[PDB]
Symmetry: C4
Subunit: 38 residues, 4 copies
């Protein structure tokens, strides 16, 4: 038992899925250029 490990293995899966979820890499770069300037 001791779910402490269970939460540990899941915390690792989270950061992983999250990393990719953030690096998804989207197209359309002009949009970002417009967000910075006008």
């Amino acid at each position: 038992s001791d779910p402490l490990v269970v939460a540990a293995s899941i915390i690792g899966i989270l950061h992983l899925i999250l990393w990719i979820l953030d690096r998804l890499f989207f197209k359309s770069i002009y949009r970002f250029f417009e967000h910075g300037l006008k």
Copy 2:
């Protein structure tokens, strides 16, 4: 049951909350432009 795991699960909670902390900087691109140039 030893603390070794306690520090492990916590080390994950940190790296995670941290990375997300840097991602909340979404947008705000003009600041990066003025930072590079003069």
Copy 3:
């Protein structure tokens, strides 16, 4: 008997080799500047 940890230590080895692998490939900025301003 308790592979839960085995999968945990491996989940970290992945996220790790990943972040690094992504840091070895991220140059090519002129291609983004063009594909964007079009």
Copy 4:
């Protein structure tokens, strides 16, 4: 001694000091601009 965890907690300590250490390298942005140009 079930070192499996020892390697796990250490694998996390690395990924952490790494992400940060990498965040202390990117100092100015004019370097990325000169990289793309040409």
